[PDB]
Design a protein around this ligand. Sequence first.
Ligand code: SF4
Length: 266
Amino acid sequence: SAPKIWEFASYNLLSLFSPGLEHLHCDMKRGFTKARRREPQVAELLQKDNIHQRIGILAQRGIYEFYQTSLIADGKDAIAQTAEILQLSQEVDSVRIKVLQILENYHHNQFLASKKIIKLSRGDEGFPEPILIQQGNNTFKLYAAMDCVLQEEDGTLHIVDFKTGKSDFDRRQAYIYLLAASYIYPQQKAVASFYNLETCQQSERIIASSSILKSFQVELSSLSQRHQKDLYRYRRNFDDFNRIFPPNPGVSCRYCAFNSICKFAM
Ligand code: SF4
């Protein structure tokens, strides 16, 4: 007889509240994405996939497949083999050439080759299993998908977050991964870093004391409650939508799935 826990937090949720990408932040976008997502006219705009999402999904799959085929060399062209597995010829050509650049970069810098792989996601999986956290009088689910976990010589776990595109690294995501690792890999030292598969730019190695992670857990617990309160307030009175999820029209609208239905779209 375990009650369902509705409260949850994740980097994705956090980013929809607190955004280098602050200019496109819009709370009304989150209102559509989370509070109105079942409305037919909203659901149909959410069922369309993005090019950057596409490049990212294929990039993760591409690293996974390149690595897999490289374990026991077969003498073949691993870049061409991986491109064939990914069916890049069926993608928009912009997408193809970016994934091919990512594969060329990996071929020249096979950063997984000699390493002890704890986790390497293919990118095709769904949401991770939740981590159930009690913080004060709140219980919430933490969702954190780790693209890559390596084990270093001294036993330290290295969480690597793969980036593509022109995005800047958001170190809050690294701290989310380090918090999650304290639950997934208990009593194991961990470090986190970012690596842009396309530009080969890397962040520093990020570590977090137990105190810093505890305080981030506090912040995520607060987020989980605020989000449920936003939803409750909207469901209690739909006419409060605009006040609960205020619009920020302008630059934000250029990359918003809901411009065709939003009353404030520019
Ligand atoms: S169309 Fe513009 S104002 Fe409306 S939700 Fe999207 S970004 Fe916000």
